[PDB]
Each structure stands twice: as structure tokens, then as C-alpha cells.
Amino acid sequence: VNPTVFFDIAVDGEPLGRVSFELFADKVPKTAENFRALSTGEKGFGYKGSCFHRIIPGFMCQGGDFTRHNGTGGKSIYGKFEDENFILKHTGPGILSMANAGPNTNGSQFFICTAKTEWLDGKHVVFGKVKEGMNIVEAMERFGSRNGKTSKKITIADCGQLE
């Protein structure tokens, strides 16, 4: 069964709302498990309290750097890891996909698309989709800018698994 995970988002500490994601463990099990475990914190580390350091309106929200807090850091539950496959494409808003530094450099950083990002197909591993709370993602998006810097700090105040 494909797991469901949630982020509770805050804006400069003010609770905003919840975003939930279906993780496509049937197609990309290793990539899904990494995100799931980092979301629960069950390995002893993960996304809770980290920020979306880069948000570009009309494009995506990028987060998952819980080691350096600025996009330069990140670590998977495996100690980087391989691009599992490119079966799923960046088809529209709500797509959940891995940030990277080129081939086989998956860590913990990810992005939530707010539009179709077809130009990233074959280069970033898609592993989930927003299930509920796309309205919250759209609210987050408004705090971004062209260069990615956010006008208020957008944080994962809490995160975990629903199903």
C-alpha cells in the first residue's frame, strides 16, 4: 500500500495548514521510504522543523535540507542514493520529486511542483503527489520570489505519517 504523509506548515511560526502526500512506493519504493522515514523522524532525524529555503511562484517549493538549512546540505536514511527510475513524469501541480546535484545524488531535498515542470523529466525522480492541502501549497507559494528567497520563513512545524 502507498503510504500517506503529512506536513504541518507554518509562516514565521504562524500555523498555516496541512499538506498530505501519497508516496508512490509501488513504483519507487526506495525513494518513497526515504521521504516517509524522514517525515516521521523514526530513524532519529528528519524534516520536522526544517524550512522551504527556495520557493519560486509558478514553479515549485523546495525543502528538505535539515543539516545546513539552506540547500547546501541534506542526507538520506541510507547514509546519497541512486536515481531509482524515471517512470513518473512532472505532469502538473502537486507533483513531489527529488532535488539533486546531477545523476545519483539523491539525499533528503525534494520539491513540490506548483505547475507542470516537464523540462525536469528524466533528471529528477518523481515519487509522490499532493493528496490534500494544495490550497496550503498555493498559500506557501505566495511567500516565494523569482530568485527563491522567501519573504517569511516557511517551515515544517510538524510532519508524520497518516496511513
Binding site: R54, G71, N100, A101, T105, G107, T117, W119, L120
Partner: peptide, 11 residues
């Protein structure tokens, strides 16, 4: 451009 990288953010 519009990229999602970890390390050098590019065009």
C-alpha cells in the same frame, strides 16, 4: 532557468 539543484542554484 527553473532548476531544483542541491549545491549550485543555476539559470
Amino acid at each position: 532557468x527553473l532548476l531544483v539543484t542541491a549545491x549550485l542554484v543555476l539559470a
